[PDB]
Amino acid sequence: LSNQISGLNVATRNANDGISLAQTAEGALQQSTNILQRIRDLALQSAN
Amino acid sequence: GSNSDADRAALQKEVAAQQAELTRISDTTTFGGRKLLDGSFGTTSFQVG
């Protein structure tokens, strides 16, 4: 049980690290969605 | 009266001035350096969707 609890603690720490990495991914992908939105705006006004 | 105005020549000058002024109305409508009603209107298509 001590081995199991220690492994589970370090695994929760690794999982939180992965959550932070995936949250950075969420932010970067939201930024790219904003860029693609602006690209759609400039493309549609590019009808000119 | 078909003969009363011997200045039909001056009348023709008036008409030619009007014609040149119409040809000028053709130009000078350069809404964007792209004078619309004369010359080069590529039958454009304003995208609205």
Alpha-carbon distance A32 to nearest alpha carbon in chain B (angstroms): 24
Integer Cα distance of A28 and A17 in angstroms: 17
Alpha-carbon distance B33 to nearest alpha carbon in chain A (angstroms): 14
Q: Tell me the structure's resolution in angstroms, rounded to a single decimal.
A: 4.2
A45: nearest CA partner in chain B:
B47
Q: Which residues of A19-38 are buried (b: 16+ CB within 10 A; e: fewer)?
A: eeeeeeeeeeeeeeeeeeee
DSSP annotation of B46 reads -
Per residue, what are the HEC states of A4-18?
HHHHHHHHHHHHHHH
Kindly list the distances between the CA atom of residue A5 and the CA atoms of A1, A11, B44, in Å, as whole numbers in the listed order. 6, 10, 72
Kindly list the distances between the CA atom of residue B28 and the CA atoms of B14, B18, B25, B37, B41, in Å, as whole numbers in the listed order. 21, 16, 6, 10, 14
Integer Cα distance of B17 and B38 in angstroms: 19
Judge whether B47 is closer than 8 Å to chain A, CB to CB: yes
Among left, alpha and beta (phi > 0; psi -120 to 50; other), residue A5 is: alpha
- What's the count of helices (H) and strands (E) in chain B, helices before strands? 1, 0
Number of A/B CB contacts below 8 angstroms equals 3
Which of these, B39, B18, B17, lies nearest to B29 by C-alpha position?
B39
Q: Is B47 in Cβ contact with A44 (below 8 Å)?
A: yes
